[PDB]
Amino acid sequence: MGKAYYDIVGSDNRWGIRHDDDPTGDYSSKEAAFEAACAAASNAIKFGHEVRITVPGNDGSETNLGVITN
């Protein structure tokens, strides 16, 4: 029903995943996002890239629950 889009940041020094709490609608494909995200994540940990996990969920009371991931 919703759209599981994760906003990924690409940096060999600062790698981070942001859960798009506000459905932007900009994504090439669901698999493309996960595929690239996990692929980049592997490289990140592999090279010692800092890992930042920012995925708001049920804790986002102010953002009227920015979940919509289904």
Side-chain angles (χ1 to χ4, degrees):
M1 172 63 185
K3 292 181 179 63
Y5 171 68
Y6 291 88
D7 172 52
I8 69 175
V9 179
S11 296
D12 66 296
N13 287 96
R14 308 298 298 273
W15 184 86
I17 301 297
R18 182 191 70 87
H19 179 243
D20 199 40
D21 51 298
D22 188 62
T24 44
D26 288 281
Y27 62 94
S28 305
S29 181
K30 185 184 181 182
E31 68 189 77
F34 289 104
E35 180 181 77
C38 61
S42 301
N43 177 36
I45 304 171
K46 184 178 181 179
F47 200 73
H49 296 182
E50 184 197 274
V51 54
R52 198 71 273 119
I53 302 173
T54 306
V55 295
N58 192 87
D59 58 302
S61 183
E62 297 180 70
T63 38
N64 57 265
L65 296 312
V67 186
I68 54 88
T69 180
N70 66 94

